[PDB]
Design a protein around this ligand. Structure first.
Ligand code: PGW
Ligand code: PGW
Ligand code: PGW
Ligand code: PIO
Ligand code: PX2
Ligand code: CLR
Ligand code: PLM
Ligand code: PLM
Ligand code: PLM
Ligand code: PLM
Ligand code: D10
Ligand code: HEX
Ligand code: HEX
Ligand code: CL
Lengths: 193, 175, 146, 77, 33
């Protein structure tokens, strides 16, 4: 019975590592790709915008998407809420990459403590991702966001613009991060047995 | 000849026809052939880089117990190569592609880095913290002393030989 | 127009990476070789300070971080962290129903620090892993995702 | 000024660089002689004694630098 | 371009559901004594 226990522990730990890498990829993708929100048929102007980067059409029956906004520049970001959300998502990226680095500690340190270290680190990363996702709609009142979506759009109000794949992917990342953190906690305790 | 950088080898004079949307036009052409003067870059860039590489390789001939000394060689030669590289690139037109001098400096920088890594590998295997005292006899295999590192003995041949053949192929290629 | 990266690859990316590797070399130097490790760390820091000067020679004085600036900054933090790691090591060596509770099912308050002597063993693999992960996210980000 | 060909100042700086480089090689040679050839057991002294090599360097390096300075200044002035 | 996002949303949610399914399976492996 003990060898089945240990083999299942090893396999589940390996799987937890792959899913941690998958969530890290999700975090990088959602931070980079600007498809958190998108235009609609009724939108005054076309385009899309993410945490910091936003592209908008000129409005002459073509694309001509003028694009602006990089996280390295803290001024081009439309609003302070967007800046806070981008900072929180970046901190979540750093935390999850830190746990993937802490996979290196499995050689020397006791397995339980490193499992708990990634557990707490993934929980903190998930908390940061939740804070970013909750703070991001607060910035929809910005004059650029209003000019794109229209006057009806506002704080915590989508209006005509529709959420694109990146936002729901970030929510999925939030759920994944919570459950990966709990998985790491239980794995770290189950190594002790 | 008001040329400082180049030497005017000669000129070639010719004539031709150039096409255009407006029509065909006669074009009288001259071509002045210029060859760059190499001595300045040899004395200013290539020679100090070669001497820095030689200094980096000189570290292999010291006893393995002089850990601060060999570390100081490695890192200060790295810093010297960095300074030489920056200076050599400063006085050159700002082209984004790599020239021959850039490749030479890159290979020299890699050689210096490799010499420092070689010392790190040698020091990882050093056992005793004390060097030979001179008076005591070393029984070939304090009472016991560290042997001369076979890594150092191999590097003493490998590094100068590799740098020499690199110089041979480089100068044969570009000259 | 698209910029060419050959000069920047040869001149600043590869040298900065190599200086970071030389900073890692301190972790394999034997402890108690205090002058050697201290000199190595601080002189690698000086070399990164020298290398960071040429990052912005071509550009105007824009007030945002470029990709080159970010790479150089991260490498500077890496060498700084290596030196601080050795400093810490030297200082500490010279001198209800889930399973249990909210102190044993989390925060490890049973023994934990104690094992600081093995900090070099951690940094030997932690630092290359962190730098390799940073390069994977760095290069994939600037080339493919955006 | 950027005038790419060899000049008097370039020759002087190269000479001084060669002298400091040679001093570093001299120490390296002394170290190898003591620690490398050791365990196996002006006119140049014998290579065996490291103090002899150091004394020879003490006498010769200032003399050679003075000779280089004399040749340079007389050739250019 | 048809400015509608349903297939994109559908496939993204499918991938997310797959990931959460695998992770709850990991809990099923653990919590089952
Ligand atoms: C694209 C991104 C690239 C990602 C690359 C990330 C790589 C990051 C760097 C290093 C990872 C190091 C992993 C080392 C794991 C080796 C762990 C091991 O040796 O086996 C045992 C099981 O451990 C365990 O169950 C822990 C399991 C660890 C699982 C983590 C490694 C999986 C990496 C698989 C790669 C998948 C890539 C796929 C991406 C699509 C523990 O030993 P041990 O009992 O003797 O100790 C007990 C004590 O007394 C002394 O250590
Ligand atoms: C300490 C002992 C005392 C040493 C004392 C010597 C001190 C150091 C040497 C010379 C200083 C003289 C000043 C330097 C003057 C520059 C040398 C020079 O004039 O010859 C050049 C040859 O270039 C060239 O072949 C390019 C080659 C440059 C020389 C280096 C190549 C070999 C390096 C192999 C690496 C070995 C590593 C060692 C490993 C063990 C060009 O001339 P050339 O008329 O054609 O005009 C062409 C026209 O374009 C204007 O020059
Ligand atoms: C050792 C690291 C070697 C790194 C290779 C660095 C390298 O490629 O150097 C080339 C020039 O120098 C060379 O002859 C390279 C000589 C390599 C000798 C390797 C011995 C070590 C430049 O390459 P490129 O594309 O500009 O072609 C130029 C064209 O003229 C070759 O026919
Ligand atoms: C980048 C990382 C690369 C890793 C490279 C890894 C290369 C590598 O693993 O080296 C191993 C070995 C160590 O060299 P090294 O000179 O330090 O050998 C030891 C040294 O001589 C000690 O002094 C000896 O103890 P002691 O003094 O008598 O008390 C000890 O013998 P013993 O104690 O057992 O009796 C020796 O083992 O040298 C090679 O064979 C490599 C030759 C090829 C070198 C090629 C060089 C170009
Ligand atoms: C220029 C690049 C050169 C890279 C050469 C890497 C060679 C390293 C081989 C490691 C040899 C080894 O396992 O022994 C050292 C320690 C064992 O612990 P200890 O008892 O010797 O303190 O082992 C460890 O605990 C950690 C060893 C290091 C593993 C990670 C190496 C990653 C190197 C890539 C650098 C870019
Ligand atoms: C220390 C280890 C474990 C984690 C390292 C975190 C790395 C991957 C983080 C830290 C800062 C981050 C960068 C911060 C800002 C930007 C600008 C943005 O327009 C593209 C992404 C980019 C370029 C980020 C990429 C990822 C990044 C380089
Ligand atoms: C980033 C790495 C920097 C260079 C570090 C070089 C030190 C290498 C030391 C390990 C050599 C291999 C040891 C083999 C195991 C053994 O027999 O001792
Ligand atoms: C301000 C940071 C400076 C860098 C300091 C690096 C080395 C610090 C070593 C650990 C300091 C904390 C230990 C406190 C214990 C004590 O009371 O002495
Ligand atoms: C850089 C290396 C940082 C290492 C941090 C400590 C790792 C965990 C130490 C042991 C944990 C424990 O069991 O108390
Ligand atoms: C071995 C540890 C270091 C890991 C990082 C290795 C990557 C170093 C970066 C080298 C610059 C590569 C430039 C890529 C862009 C290009 O050449 O087109
Ligand atoms: C396929 C897109 C990959 C994006 C980079 C993933 C980085 C993972 C963390 C190292
Ligand atoms: C260029 C480095 C050569 C190393 C030979 C062992
Ligand atoms: C690249 C340096 C190799 C040193 C000898 C193992
Ligand atoms: Cl950007």
């Amino acid at each position: 019975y003990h060898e089945h226990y240990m083999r299942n522990s090893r396999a589940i730990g390996v799987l937890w590592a792959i899913f941690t890498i998958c969530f890290a990829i999700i975090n990088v993708v959602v931070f980079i790709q600007p498809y958190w929100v998108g235009d609609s048929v009724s939108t005054p102007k076309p385009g899309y915008f993410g945490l910091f980067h936003y592209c908008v059409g000129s409005g002459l029956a073509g694309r001509e998407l003028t694009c602006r906004g990089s996280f390295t520049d803290f001024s081009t970001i439309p609003s302070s809420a967007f800046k806070a959300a981008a900072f929180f998502v970046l901190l979540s990226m750093v935390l999850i990459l830190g746990c993937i680095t802490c996979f290196s500690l499995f050689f020397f340190c006791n397995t339980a403590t490193v499992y708990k270290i990634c557990a707490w680190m993934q929980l903190l990363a998930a908390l940061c991702l939740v804070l970013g996702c909750m703070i991001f709609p607060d910035g929809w009142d910005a004059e650029t966001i209003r000019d794109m979506c229209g006057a009806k759009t506002g704080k915590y109000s989508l209006g005509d613009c529709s959420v694109r794949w990146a936002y729901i992917l970030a929510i999925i990342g939030i759920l994944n991060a919570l459950i990966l953190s709990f998985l790491a906690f239980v794995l770290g305790n189950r190594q002790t047995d | 000849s008001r040329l400082n950088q180049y030497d005017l080898l000669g000129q070639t004079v010719d004539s031709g026809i150039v096409q255009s949307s407006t029509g065909e036009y006669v074009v009288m052409t001259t071509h002045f052939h210029l060859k760059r003067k190499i001595g300045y870059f040899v004395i200013q860039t290539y020679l100090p880089c070669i001497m820095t590489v030689i200094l980096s390789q000189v570290s292999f001939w010291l006893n393995r117990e002089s850990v601060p000394a060999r570390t100081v060689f490695g890192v200060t030669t790295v810093l010297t190569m960095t300074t030489l590289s920056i200076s050599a690139r400063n006085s050159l037109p700002k082209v984004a592609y790599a020239t021959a001098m850039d490749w030479f400096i890159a290979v020299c920088y890699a050689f210096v880095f490799s010499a420092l890594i070689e010392f790190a590998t040698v020091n990882y295997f050093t056992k005793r913290g004390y060097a030979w005292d001179g008076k005591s006899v070393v029984p070939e295999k304090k009472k016991t002393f560290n042997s001369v590192s076979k890594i150092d003995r191999l590097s003493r041949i490998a590094f100068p030989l590799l740098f020499g053949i690199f110089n041979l192929v480089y100068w044969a290629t570009y000259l | 127009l698209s910029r060419r990266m050959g000069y920047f690859t040869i001149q600043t990316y590869i040298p900065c990476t190599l200086i970071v590797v030389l900073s890692w070399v301190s972790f394999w130097i034997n402890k108690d070789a205090v002058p050697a490790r201290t000199s190595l760390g601080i002189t690698t820091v000086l070399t990164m300070t020298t290398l960071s000067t040429i990052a912005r020679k071509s550009l105007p004085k824009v007030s945002y971080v470029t990709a080159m600036d970010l790479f150089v900054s991260v490498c500077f933090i890496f060498v700084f962290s290596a030196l601080v790691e050795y400093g810490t090591l030297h200082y500490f060596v010279s001198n209800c129903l889930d399973g249990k509770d909210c102190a044993s099912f989390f925060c490890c308050f049973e023994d934990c620090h104690i094992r600081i002597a093995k900090m070099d063993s951690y940094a030997r693999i932690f630092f290359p892993t962190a730098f390799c992960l940073f390069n994977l996210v760095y290069w994939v980000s600037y080339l493919y995702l955006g | 000024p950027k005038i790419p060909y060899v000049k008097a100042i370039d020759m002087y700086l190269m000479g001084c660089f060669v002298f400091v480089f040679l001093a570093l090689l001299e120490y390296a040679f002394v170290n190898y002689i003591f620690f490398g050839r050791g365990p196996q057991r002006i006119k140049i002294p014998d290579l065996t004694d490291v103090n002899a090599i150091d004394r020879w360097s003490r006498i010769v390096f200032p003399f050679t630098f003075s000779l280089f300075n004399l040749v340079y200044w007389l050739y250019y002035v | 371009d048809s400015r509608d996002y349903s297939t994109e949303l559908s496939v993204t949610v499918a991938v997310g559901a797959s990931l959460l399914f695998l992770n709850i399976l990991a809990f099923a492996a653990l919590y089952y004594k």
